[PDB]
Structures are given as structure tokens and as C-alpha cells.
């Protein structure tokens, strides 16, 4: 009734049939957290929304080297409602873990309940600017994915990758240029930000624009090298 | 009043059907994907086929650049036409839903303006250049 196809990034599948969808496995069946549908072929599967997750349009916008691998450990900054976090727990599975943080309270409560539902998650609900009150908890992660709309993305990502990220670690950042500047070319804002990170010791591999899914948004990926 | 309730009900049905169609169905991405390569000579010597280590068709394809190592339709009946006809027709069904919704929106605009001409107030009938009329109420507090 439906064909599956594996994807270059492992843990990412595409259902090809009468209608094409981007899909992952699941760990705790008999559920659906955010009203998203599913498909069960036999094994359960769960689709994303690139209109609702940034990382999805990261993938299906065509993204060469994402470093979230199934076994690994992934920090997540700016997890409002944790829908993308649920997708992260699906794509890591039980041998990898996810470290999802949120500042405010209502996405925090929803985060907490979904973390109750799932094993792979530990939620940090403390503020994101200060990394100490959870260096107590987080343990020596592999990769970092962050979307914060606060304009100190360079500073927050610098501090969190300094404190936690493995050497030769993976870092993937989102950007909304319309939050940063809202005067000039979104390309110009993006080039300004890759210069920030390149000063801040992250070697930038790839830049990508999510043009038919969001407006003016960028995803930047890179390696992290030789720090403490 | 009963008329505009009817129209708005139909529009809300169609709006939700549009949302669910877009949720079900996938659109192709189109974004600038720019590589950061340090040395000018290897920048000049770039090829996508080695970099994404694939074949030129699968290179221009951008939802699955499954590698050669990854690489190392008979299911759907007549996939050349039936599958593609179905793909396009799902797209057209979402589009047709959309036009239904915009038209019902406009009908409700006209009906709502009339209902409020009926209500009260001291109106004024102003006439635009283009032929379109409009009303503008006197500056008064409703009591």
C-alpha cells in the first residue's frame, strides 16, 4: 500500500506512494503527541512538518552532512513545545540521548509531559543564557542544534559549545535575519553571522536557505575544533 | 444574519480542508545551498559528484542524495502515468480548495458590509473613481 525508501541521513525515511511524506520511526507507539499523523507498515512510522519544524526543511531542502547520528548525544537549545524534540528522539533512538532546554513556562510544561512520555529526553527547563545550572546535569554531548530568536545566538552558541560540545563536534544553528536586522539583504545578515562563528572558532561547512518553507530563514552547519 | 452564518460555516469547512491537504502532501524545496571551500584552486576544481559522491541525476535531485555506497517502480501499477497523474491531481485538489475558500471569503465581505448598512448610524455614500462605492459613517459615539 506504501513503499518506504531510506534516506542518506540515517534514521530518515521517505514514504513514496500516492503521496510522498518525510518520516521517521517511533519508540513509544500507540500515541501521537502534537496532532501529527502517522503510518504503520509491520512497524509504526511518524511524519514531520517542514512547515512546523525547521530541521525538516533543513533535511528536505537538501542537506549534505548533518551530524545527528543514531547512536549519539544531541543538545537542543530553544525547544518550544518539543515537537522537533520528539522527532529528535525518534531519529536517535534508545542508544542516543537528547538534551532539550527551554526558558519560559508553557512550552516548558508541554516539554515536561512529552519528556514524561519518552525515554530519550532529558529536559532542562532552566534559562538558556547561563550554562552552569545545567553543566551540573548535561553530560559531554556530541552535537548541538539550536534555534533561539534572541539576538545573541553567537554568544549563547559560543558558550554552550565551549562548555559541552565534543571536539570536532557538530553544530547546527538556525537564523531569522528578520529578527537580527530587518533593514538589509537577508543574505547580508547571514554572511555577517557566519563571520561571527568563524571568529568564534567554529569551522563552517554549509549554509542553506529555507526559501519555500519559511521566509528569510537560514540553517548553518559546521564543525567544532580544539577548545575547552 | 442567517445568511452570513451560512456562508461563514462553508468557508470554515473549506479552510480546514485546505490545512489538512497541505499537511498530507509534500512540496519540493528550493533554496540556495552554498558550500564553504577554503582554497581557491579546489574551489575551482569542485565537482558535486565527488562532493556528494553521487550521480548527476541524483545530484540535481535534492530530497535524497543517497550515495553510491547507499546505492550498493514495479509496485505501483503503470507508474509513468498513473502515479504522476495522481500526484498532479492531489496538487490540483488542494488548489481548487483554495479558490473555493477565497471566493467564499469575498461573498462574506459583501454580505457583511450590507448587514452593517442596515444597522444604524448616519452614513454617507461616497463614490470612488473606479466605479466602486463605499460608505463612511458620521463621527459620532454610539450611545
Amino acid at each position: 500500500k506504501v513503499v518506504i525508501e531510506p534516506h542518506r541521513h540515517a534514521g530518515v525515511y521517505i514514504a513514496r506512494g500516492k503521496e510522498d511524506l518525510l518520516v521517521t520511526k517511533n519508540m513509544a507507539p500507540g500515541e501521537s503527541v502534537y496532532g501529527e499523523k502517522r503510518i504503520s507498515v509491520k512497524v509504526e512510522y511518524r511524519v514531520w512538518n517542514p512547515f512546523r519544524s525547521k530541521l525538516a526543511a533543513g533535511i528536505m531542502g537538501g542537506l549534505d552532512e548533518l551530524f545527528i547520528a543514531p547512536g549519539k548525544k544531541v543538545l537542543y537549545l530553544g525547544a518550544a513545545s518539543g515537537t522537533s524534540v520528539s522527532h529528535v528522539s525518534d531519529v536517535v533512538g534508545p542508544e542516543g540521548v537528547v538534551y532539550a532546554v527551554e526558558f519560559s513556562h508553557r512550552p516548558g510544561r508541554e516539554l515536561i509531559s512529552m519528556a514524561k512520555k519518552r525515554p530519550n529526553i532529558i529536559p532542562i527547563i532552566e534559562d538558556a543564557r547561563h550554562p552552569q545550572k545545567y553543566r551540573m546535569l548535561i553530560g559531554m554531548v556530541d552535537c548541538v542544534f539550536a534555534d533561539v530568536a534572541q539576538p545573541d545566538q553567537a554568544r549563547i552558541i559560543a558558550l554552550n559549545s565551549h562548555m559541552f560540545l565534543k571536539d570536532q563536534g557538530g553544530v547546527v544553528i538556525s537564523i531569522k535575519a528578520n529578527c537580527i536586522d530587518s533593514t538589509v539583504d537577508a543574505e547580508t545578515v547571514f554572511a555577517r553571522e557566519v563571520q561571527k562563528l568563524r571568529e568564534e572558532r567554529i569551522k563552517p561547512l554549509e549554509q542553506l536557505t529555507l526559501e519555500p518553507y519559511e521566509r528569510d530563514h537560514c540553517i548553518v552547519v559546521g564543525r567544532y575544533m580544539r577548545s575547552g | 444574519t442567517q445568511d452570513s452564518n451560512y456562508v461563514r460555516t462553508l468557508r470554515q469547512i473549506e479552510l480546514k480542508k485546505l490545512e489538512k491537504g497541505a499537511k498530507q502532501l509534500m512540496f519540493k524545496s528550493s533554496g540556495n545551498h552554498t558550500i564553504f571551500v577554503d582554497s581557491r584552486e579546489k574551489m575551482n576544481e569542485f565537482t558535486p559528484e565527488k562532493f556528494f559522491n553521487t550521480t548527476s541525476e541524483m545530484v540535481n535531485r535534492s530530497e535524497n542524495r543517497l550515495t553510491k555506497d547507499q546505492l550498493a517502480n514495479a509496485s505501483s501499477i503503470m507508474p509513468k502515468e498513473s502515479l504522476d497523474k495522481k500526484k498532479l491531481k492531489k496538487f490540483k485538489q488542494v488548489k481548487q480548495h483554495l479558490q473555493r475558500e477565497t471566493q467564499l471569503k469575498q461573498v462574506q465581505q459583501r454580505m457583511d458590509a450590507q448587514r452593517e448598512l442596515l444597522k444604524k448610524g448616519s452614513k454617507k455614500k461616497i463614490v470612488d473613481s473606479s466605479g466602486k462605492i463605499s460608505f463612511k459613517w458620521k463621527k459620532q459615539r454610539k450611545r
Binding site: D20 | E63, L66, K68, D84, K87
Partner: peptide, 27 residues
């Protein structure tokens, strides 16, 4: 080496038909 390139072309067409169009990729 031809065994590689033959298998290369093999699954290529097995996926080329699964996810493409020509007359439909316009509309």
C-alpha cells in the same frame, strides 16, 4: 570496475522512476 558501474546504473533507474517527472515537473 564495470560491476560497480553496472550496479551503479542498476539502482539508479530503480530510484529514478520512483521520484521524478518531465511533463509533470512543470505543472
Amino acid at each position: 570496475r564495470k560491476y560497480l558501474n553496472k550496479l551503479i546504473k542498476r539502482n539508479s533507474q530503480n530510484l529514478r522512476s520512483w521520484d521524478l517527472e518531465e511533463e509533470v515537473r512543470d505543472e
